[PDB]
Symmetry: C3
């Protein structure tokens, strides 16, 4: 309780843990192999986030980075979460649309670069250079969003209508929520320091729970995850 | 020689190195693609463990974690080993039975969570919280063992008898040996500190060599690794 | 500018960034799924290297390792680069020849061991043991080079001539350039310290740009990357 942001770390931990259990239970029984992929991916995403939220809450996932003449609290465990959970989320989208393997490789690799350069930016001790890493990471994010909108135009002649519908919704959810993360980082504790860490942590908790549990509710309620038969 | 546990690190290094060379030589010549997968996976497992045993023996893979009012010797390199070798072992099992891709994803991801939360527990400076990580990691292990016994019931109508037989043996080997690891950690140097590090290191060496070289001897002697023709 | 090797880090950053942009633009429009794999892999390789070159240039990717009675400058970010980019390069070769999945697993796993043991060697504080890690890593490299020459003899009865031709060239490029890396490390800052860091950094920059951008120019100009139709 001694860091003001504890309450949002504790609520994030609980909501990710509850979402994990819900999806775990929801997927019991599923035999359709395509459906099984989606449940597996979509359950792992909040399970991983539960662990990293808990590491932040307990303090393990916090470090102090000197920059700006200050010791700055930096929650590094978010990058360990996102390193795995953001390619998994892209994989759910790419599987919806039957993406080509090269497109998946492009997505997962640009996502790696996005999270890894965000982590270097987050731990960089020269203040001005933190924003060079931010810009590179943002360029990788823009590439991802570009591919999600313009990279699947060979696939629309052979998409089931329900897959197109669910993919469109989830792609919109993704673009809107993910685009907020660089803005929060830029104005928050890792960037300009205009928004205090407590509010930052709240913002990321709302985005994370929506981008993981909200996303997954939409996906796992859809008939698009089943091979049709 | 100055740490009492050196002798078990040196024997583990030698046995993993010898097992690697044996499997490397055994797999020379194999042309069956299915067989080649199994040799590749099963040889990489002790090769990786050889490297991490050597890093422990030379001291690189040891760190001191303060907790309990003490500087505690913690061999972190075991988590770097297991991060790769325990999904590889699961992959050998999953390939035996032709698992669905979603099942493989579930297994490898729960295994990631098991090893990563074990590593956080191993490096956590608040003593009581180390056991919260232990419990989460154990829950992931139980999930894995659940899937290994109850997750492949679509596959039994089209399993060759020899694949079913070898998978049953290896699955039993896996459940018994892997279930001992949380117990050793709980009573050893990373947990309650009731068993000294020297004996702990012996225990993990016996389990590791059996779970990697013993496992692999059983697998690579079986006709189940060949496509049948 | 305060480290003499800055100029080669800055030129490496620029050449990797330019090569990335060139390949990105070159691959726009490509619809052939096989071609898309090769563009994706081959573009990610210099993009990752651009980021790690920049981290070296800005100082983030440098650490001081005590060994030999000295504080030694060690650029660790090269291992973070190579961890991903050297399996990606092997994947391009393995895809050319339609390698079996077990062969790919062997290649990527031996490459992991090569880079991870090179990183342990690079960070080891006991000088003589640094060269034990070097020898293990070199053994893994030799295994890789062995597989590249002798591991694809089931594949030559069903290789398109242009794929055989491009694979031969790239395999030769690979063997020659990669074999120089252990020699540079052995005589440079991480090893015997006979070649100063500034010249070392130059050597690795020439090798990296050739092994990534030179390699990729050869590959992406070839008709071998297209499924034939
Ligand atoms: C079954 C397996 C998964 C293995 C079990 C692992 C794990 C679930 C164990 C629970 C972790 C949790 C108890 C950590 C303890 C936090 C904290 C209370 C420690 C001491 O703090 C006490 C006071 C001090 O004034 O602050 C805090 C005062 C209050 C006591 C704060 C309480 C709020 C919670 C800590 C926040 C909820 C986190 C939960 C783990 C959410 C899990 C969801 C669930 C339904 C799956
Ligand atoms: C239930 C069986 O698993 C379902 C399969 C098939 O649909 O999908 C796979 C379902 C999921 C992808 C499986 C995810 C792995 C584990 C079940 C996650 C639990 C491990 C840890 C206890 C961490 C999560 C704790 C929780 C409270 C967030
Ligand atoms: C298919 C499989 C069979 C293949 C597996 C092969 C493999 C098992 C072979 C043996 C592996 C073994 C050598 C692993 C050793 C661990 C290694 C990190 C040791 C180096 O030192 C570690 C710590 C010291 O406390 O410093 C840290 C060192 C440096 C300061 C950081 C080095 C950077 C990393 C090498 C790159 C990865 C960093 C991130 C974890 C990944 C990207 C994260 C992103 C968000 C930035
Ligand atoms: C600091 C920088 C990010 C620069 C800020 C401005 C910049 C983000 C806006 C320019 C993006 C640009 C692609 C917009 C042009 C749209 C166009 C190409 C698409 C064609 O028409 C499609 C229509 C609907 O049918 O609009 C639908 C729109 C299209 C599908 C294209 C939109 C894709 C974008 C990637 C989504 C914009 C959100 C950004 C990622 C915001 C990033 C936040 C940042 C400040 C960190
Ligand atoms: C070919 C490639 C793989 C590359 C080569 C890499 C690698 C195999 C090189 C060998 C590593 C090894 C020599 C490390 C040295 C350990 C140690 C002796 C260092 C100094 O210690 C001396 C005394 C001090 O009183 O203690 C110790 C006294 C004794 C001298 C202890 C000796 C016991 C061994 C160190 C334990 C065996 C480890 C082996 C590497 C096992 C390999 C198996 C093999 C058949 C593949
Ligand atoms: C022999 C050719 O390789 C066999 C293929 C096909 O079956 O499988 C692949 C066989 C294995 C999966 C290949 C594993 C990679 C390396 C051969 C491992 C050696 C690299 C290092 C020297 C570490 C191991 C040293 C040893 C003494 C433990
Ligand atoms: C398909 C491909 C092409 C995709 C590849 C994309 C990629 C190559 C893009 C560029 C990668 C690049 C940015 C890597 C940089 C390395 C990175 C670790 C730098 C951060 O700082 C590293 C050290 C400082 O000494 O601190 C450490 C930082 C923190 C203290 C720890 C951060 C946590 C990690 C980010 C999560 C991984 C940790 C483990 C190694 C993995 C799980 C282990 C488990 C057992 C806990
Ligand atoms: C601290 C906690 C671990 C709690 C300790 C007790 C707990 C591990 C025991 C309860 C597990 C429970 C699933 C047992 C019920 C069996 C049942 C569901 C299977 C149905 O019947 C199958 C028969 C043979 O045909 O028995 C064969 C048995 C079945 C195939 C099911 C057994 C699967 C288990 C995962 C194996 C038990 C070993 C544990 C992993 C021990 C963990 C050690 C721990 C203390 C860290
Ligand atoms: C669009 C997205 C990718 C996001 C943008 C991220 C990124 C491209 C931003 C550029 C990074 C760069 C400006 C870092 C600054 C380095 C340095 C000048 C910092 C201060 O140093 C000043 C003096 C001191 O005497 O030394 C140095 C004096 C000189 C000023 C040195 C100048 C040489 C360059 C720093 C080396 C070139 C590096 C480039 C990033 C190459 C990129 C290639 C491009 C065409 C894609
Ligand atoms: C262009 C669309 O992408 C092409 C696809 C299909 O061929 O391949 C995929 C093309 C590549 C594999 C995509 C690589 C991911 C990003 C486009 C790389 C840019 C992210 C960062 C800004 C880092 C690179 C900066 C640059 C200056 C080196
Ligand atoms: C398919 C997916 C869904 C699966 C994903 C599962 C996963 C998301 C589950 C949760 C992951 C989570 C626990 C990650 C936590 C990060 C972890 C590194 C925490 C440990 O401590 C990290 C730092 C402290 O600053 O110390 C560092 C600790 C030690 C000093 C080093 C430990 C070694 C590593 C565990 C092994 C990897 C090291 C390299 C980055 C990889 C190989 C590099 C090579 C070149 C040596
Ligand atoms: C310190 C150690 C590395 C030892 C140094 C010496 C050692 C590297 C040389 C012995 C390698 C050995 C396989 C050579 C025998 C060749 C033979 C098996 C191939 C059969 O005939 C093929 C012909 C052309 O048709 O030659 C073409 C040649 C073949 C295709 C085989 C060559 C494959 C090698 C892996 C390439 C040699 C380069 C090395 C990797 C150099 C390593 C540098 C080191 C000092 C760190
Ligand atoms: C589950 C959590 C999700 C979906 C997180 C998404 C995170 C991003 C899209 C992060 C983006 C970043 C930037 C583009 C710039 C640098 C800062 C980051 C890493 C926050
Ligand atoms: C090759 C080595 C093998 C098979 C290692 C297996 C390790 C485990 C099953 C580890 C399990 C753990 C727990 C369930 C709780 C926390 C402690 C661990 C990581 C030892
Ligand atoms: C893109 C960069 C490339 C192709 C780098 C290749 C690096 C190697 C082949 C590294 C090899 C090493 C050894 C065999 C011994 C130890 C030192 C290393 C890691 C430099």
């Amino acid at each position: 309780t001694g860091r003001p942001e504890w309450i949002w770390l504790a609520l994030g931990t609980a909501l990710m843990g509850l979402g994990t259990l819900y999806f775990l239970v929801k997927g019991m029984g599923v035999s359709d192999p395509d459906a099984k992929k989606f449940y597996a991916i979509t359950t792992l995403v909040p399970a991983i986030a539960f662990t990293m939220y808990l590491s932040m809450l307990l303090g393990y996932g916090l470090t102090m980075v000197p920059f700006g003449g200050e010791q700055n609290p930096i929650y590094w465990a978010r990058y360990a979460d996102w390193l795995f959970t953001t390619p998994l989320l892209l994989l759910d989208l790419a599987l919806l649309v039957d993406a080509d393997q090269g497109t998946i490789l492009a997505l997962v690799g640009a996502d790696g670069i996005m999270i890894g350069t965000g982590l270097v930016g987050a731990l960089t001790k020269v203040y001005s250079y933190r924003f060079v890493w931010w810009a590179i990471s943002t360029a990788a994010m823009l590439y991802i969003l570009y591919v999600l909108f313009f990279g699947f135009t060979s696939k629309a002649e052979s998409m089931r209508p329900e897959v197109a519908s669910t993919f469109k919704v989830l792609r919109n959810v993704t673009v809107v929520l993910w685009s907020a993360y660089p803005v929060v980082w830029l104005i928050g504790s890792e960037g300009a320091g205009i928004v205090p860490l407590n509010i930052e942590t709240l913002l990321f908790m709302v985005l994370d729970v929506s981008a993981k549990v909200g996303f997954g509710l939409i996906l796992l309620r859809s008939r698009a995850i089943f091979g049709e038969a």
